[PDB]
Amino acid sequence: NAMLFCDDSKKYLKEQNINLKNEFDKDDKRVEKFSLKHQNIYFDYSKNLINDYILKSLLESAEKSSLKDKIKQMFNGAKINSTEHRAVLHTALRDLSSTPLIVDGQDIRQEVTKEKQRVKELVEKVVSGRWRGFSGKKITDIVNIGIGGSDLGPKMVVRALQPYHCTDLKVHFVSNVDADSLLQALHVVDPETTLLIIASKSFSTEETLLNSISAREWLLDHYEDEKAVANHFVAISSKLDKVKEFGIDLEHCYKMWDWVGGRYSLWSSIGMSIAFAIGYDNFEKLLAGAYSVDKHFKETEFSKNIPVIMALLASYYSCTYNSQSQALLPYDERLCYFVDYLQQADMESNGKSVNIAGETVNYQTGVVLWGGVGTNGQHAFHQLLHQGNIFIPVDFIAIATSHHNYDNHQQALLANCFAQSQALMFGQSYDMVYNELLKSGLNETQAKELAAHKVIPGNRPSTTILLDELSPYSLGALIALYEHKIFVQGVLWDINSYDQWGVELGKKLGKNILKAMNDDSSDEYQNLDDSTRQLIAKVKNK
Amino acid sequence: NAMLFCDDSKKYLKEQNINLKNEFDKDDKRVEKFSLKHQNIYFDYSKNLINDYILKSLLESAEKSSLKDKIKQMFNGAKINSTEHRAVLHTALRDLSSTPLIVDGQDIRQEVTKEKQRVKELVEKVVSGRWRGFSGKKITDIVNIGIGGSDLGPKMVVRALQPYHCTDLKVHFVSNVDADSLLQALHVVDPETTLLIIASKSFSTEETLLNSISAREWLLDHYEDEKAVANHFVAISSKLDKVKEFGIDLEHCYKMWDWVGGRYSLWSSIGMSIAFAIGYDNFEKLLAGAYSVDKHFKETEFSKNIPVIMALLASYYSCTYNSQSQALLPYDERLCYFVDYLQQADMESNGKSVNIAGETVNYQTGVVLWGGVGTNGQHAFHQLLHQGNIFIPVDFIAIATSHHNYDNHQQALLANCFAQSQALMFGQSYDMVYNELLKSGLNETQAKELAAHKVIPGNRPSTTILLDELSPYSLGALIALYEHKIFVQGVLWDINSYDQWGVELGKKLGKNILKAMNDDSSDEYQNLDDSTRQLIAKVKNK
């Protein structure tokens, strides 16, 4: 009996026929109305296909929804992951309020703080040289072994904060079961000077276990002494019984809690590899930026609340325009893994077909998130954003100042970012193009033949999120904005953003296929569909 | 008066209500009917939502279209890029037929061969040490400076063919105007031992020119002698007048032709950086694999023609299911830039709103191409592919054998690939899930509460493209398959796949914004919309 977000009312808001050029021409307060600031982040949503009526209508839907309650329930540790009967407490990982929070018999404040102190001590011991490898050498390289939630956040953040690397350690990420992943790391590191991290919430993920067994075999091939495992492996998991069973002791294990979703886990001990690159002080700054956004989200009325606006715009488009993707365009090289990271956060959360009650919903839920770094994307796929006939909401991320003094490059980067959003809004008409072609020296027949092909329809929406700089703090804030957008979207759609049951079937079928690949007289092999069977046969013959 | 592909007939084919499980159960020849082989590539399209009637209907549309003629026109150098009045002759770059081909007054066979010999000689001179830097040192590093078509193909192929690197040169790619791109290269190379390549078809791209000016300033800061430019720069372009004007002489310029689209240019001299990594012999093998697919495409009846089938399936889905994206899932780490590369090839080609005649089309054209490497994607966004409610055609790329002897890893990688396509096809029903939950030890109330959340609808389509190995030759074949798919799609939609007029407006607006950023008393600044204006003001204040 949850409020329906995607209803007939939303579908009709579209009939306002918003014309962006016309709104900016006539409304001298358009930017003031449709922008927000949070500390060093400027959120400009003024190039979206909205006016006062449309926005106020969307805000009224949020107000009428359960969102106000759900926000409190998330922060207070209510079991809002309702299919798994778990709290959803990635916010607690970065808390600076110190308000009382007792969940599942644990003092969450004490739990979080204590594990942070342990990670901090580990990083300090390793960087200072007090931790030595088994042959007594100082560690020079860190290898994280993990996949999905146990890989993407650390990998993305270590890249994004490259200018802040300061530990004299090189950090490597092994993830895919494809052994190329492991081998890219092992080919450039020395077993005597490498600390390996097995990062797995479940400690049962096939790829991570295979990779960890292979890494252990490599280490033991070198040392020929099982005691070497003590100086070269640590583990991050919620299943410490399984870590012990693997052969790593509890003093070498760093716990995470069931209420830390993998795709919201970089803030936890899974972030260890981040601290190994940029130091623990910078890790605390990352956390503190996220906290600032948590406080904003929890405390701010919806009309001035950045994640709530982000969520309403996105769900409005995918409802009323029936769009099936969103483009995210980060105009900074350092954010090269940001789209990949948010693909997991967004699509693994909101790619759900049933509501909280288990009923199949008759409205579309999460859409495809894609994009690419600017300005490169301008030369790859912005052609489609400008002249294709697919409706695609666009977010630009701009960074005002970079880490170097090539000011001309930085100015051009930003000019391009702002030009792309301006181009989406304005387009260029047939008459404008035709006149330009004449002025360029084409005759009338040539101008008439070409002009239609150069018309850019325009009136296409964008949001620009401008950061003062890409620091640990501002990056933490930026990621949290999207975490909360995703949350708000799932609440409005009445889905569970925090489970991921859809991946189970593939895991099961993968085990059966491995059996079939090893024994064609097996029941597994006989029960395959013939496409799978013939794919297995084609691999065997090669 | 071109045949309409997306017509009422296509929309009704869907009412066949194909059930994949049922087809495989009842049709013992399903795989034989809906798979093809080309040399070392197995193309299995049997898990697509088709039967004989649907496929034969699609094939009849291709037969009735202008496709047969268009294929000949492309290969023979007809000016099928009709808005620019240019031939489209990326196929000629890899030709092994040696058939006569004279286009725009040039013997294309002589032209292509001669430039290949020049690139081969350059690579050999540099690798052997006969080419020296200005201080007489042997070159150790190559830096490609280019964006889009002048970056992505070389970058993707150099990565994809990493095991075949053999020149003792390290190759770096500078692209974005964001100076982080340039600086990542310059921070790890010595000006005395680095050869820089300015790759730009037009020689007028803002980012590439800024990067090249900055790289030249770096080289001259070191040497303090303009004569050093001769030993440290070469250029690849179609505009040799502009290269001369920049300061590089013609003996240091490597030409490309107007009929080489940027997004189809890695086969030309733009591929120089590929040859610098893997040697010219392996570059010839890459070309030869593409040729094999060209020959297949040109000569094969449509029912047995892999690119034609790929194109018909893709356009059928986006027409009749109104899907707005396609997922591409390469199950090999080496293909980490393959999606990025095909995003340009596909979306920059087919993101068009007007037909050849300039009329706005009333059917959807190119859709969003996205995806990610497997098995990683399984832990990021396959949740949405399995349980979301977005219709998304899926292509899997599988590689039977890798470059190492971790056979257990390779077997698991493939098992996962095949399990994912099997899972898409089958799903798991409520009764199956409920019974599994009981067998796992849940009581009836718990099983009933959870089961709906674990249901995976299934009946979702995929294609699996299996290569024997990822060699220069097989990679060349694979890329060409997609090049021709894109071509066939554009022909059926009656659009020009080979222009890209949509990017022009942003370039123009970027110049005006740069003027506005430097002078707020300018006409440029006064004419801005207020969102752009306030973004510029926020950058200035920081």
Ligand SMILES: O=P(O)(O)OC[C@H]1O[C@@](O)(CO)[C@@H](O)[C@@H]1O
């Ligand atoms: O090679 P150039 O001329 O520098 O152009 C770079 C890229 O920019 C484009 O988007 C055209 O602007 C692509 O088609 C092209 O490959």
Ligand SMILES: O=P(O)(O)OC[C@H]1O[C@@](O)(CO)[C@@H](O)[C@@H]1O
């Ligand atoms: O950290 P783990 O338990 O190894 O799981 C890895 C990833 O796999 C999942 O797709 C679940 O299978 C993600 O939610 C998770 O982050």
Ligand code: NA
């Ligand atoms: Na409410």
Ligand code: NA
């Ligand atoms: Na025909």
